[PDB]
Design a protein around this ligand. Structure first.
Ligand SMILES: [Zn+2]
Ligand SMILES: [Zn+2]
Lengths: 197, 197
DNA sequence: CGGGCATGCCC
DNA sequence: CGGGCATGCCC
């Protein structure tokens, strides 16, 4: 069976979608999301807020899993991992994991025993009463360019909502470029899309 | 006592000097030496020929040691090592060593038990009869720019001629930039010296 | 091959 | 902070 996880959007019966905060205009804003590109530009090891929106309430026990895969066909079968430098200079998160969640006391880090893929899982909590969404704080612990890790290859973050039995309730994904200057790089790729895309 | 090794030239009683081969004009020539800068520009893990010239014959038992130190005052006390990526993707040479010698059956790699500095040593052989010099083939196993290793910091290679008792007979050093495009980078730094130096 | 992009860093 | 260098890589 395939060891490449699906990245196909599946908004499913709960109308699961992701949301992203607006950000400032700074060249090196800590994180900024491009709707045109469906791509987050963010700095390493800093907060990357991601909102979970649903139209209907997931059952008790639902989980929220994040996993990175390389976007390009030629790299999709290689597991996305922390580069050797950041692993050596690295609480619960194993040092080989690229994606962490901060501020959650129930985080689990998983190393799949068959596909070798890393994932990080937290329980689904429904929005607080006055609220339309639930926000998880992700961190990516290498730059996209890290030698011996992502090595400039774009990744997708796959977010899956899964019940406690392991049924797939919803799937969304967004591309990520972890970089020194998120504002600069987002503008550069939006301009490239307009001019050459 | 100091754990920073001397880099001061000491041509000594044997009139020990280093020589370098001329190279071609290519942008990415595999190695090229700048006399103006006393600096070798070379690609990683490829041959970097270095000639040993003496006016008088070293005694039997003499050794030839190579060791890297950071050139800049602010980095001189840090040991020069292979970056974590190239160490993990790495015969006798320990994977943490930046400098190797190829084609010598008597090479020794040393990790100083007090200063933690790495060195690689081969016996001195006098030039063959028709010859003015002895050539050792060094390899540098990271680029100067390697993240988590040299990290763009220029190094000096220190070459010492040492008798078997450990007396210093001669010392010379040359700066090194290990890079993708030795021809391009040598020309760039020579032009910078002329214009801004 | 040599022109020119890449992108963390400039000190 | 934003202009511009850096330098392995372009696919
Ligand atoms: Zn990294
Ligand atoms: Zn390296």
């Amino acid at each position: 069976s395939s060891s490449v996880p699906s990245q196909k959007t599946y908004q499913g019966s709960y109308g699961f979608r992701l949301g992203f905060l607006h950000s400032g205009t700074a060249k090196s804003v800590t994180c900024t999301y491009s709707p045109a590109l469906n791509k987050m530009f963010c700095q390493l090891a800093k907060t990357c807020p991601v909102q979970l929106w649903v139209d209907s309430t997931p059952p008790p026990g639902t989980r929220v899993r994040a996993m990175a895969i390389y976007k390009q066909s030629q790299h999709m079968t290689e597991v996305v991992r922390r580069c050797p430098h950041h692993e050596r200079c690295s609480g619960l998160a194993p040092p080989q994991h690229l994606i962490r969640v901060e501020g959650n006391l129930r985080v689990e880090y998983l190393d799949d025993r068959n596909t070798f893929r890393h994932s990080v899982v937290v329980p689904y909590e429904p929005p607080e009463v006055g609220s339309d969404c639930t926000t998880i704080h992700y961190n990516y612990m290498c730059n996209s360019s890290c030698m011996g890790g992502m090595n400039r290859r774009p990744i997708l973050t796959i977010i899956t909502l899964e019940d406690s039995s392991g049924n797939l309730l919803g799937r969304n994904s967004f591309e990520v470029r972890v970089c020194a200057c998120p504002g600069r790089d987002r503008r550069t790729e939006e301009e490239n899309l307009r001019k050459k895309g």
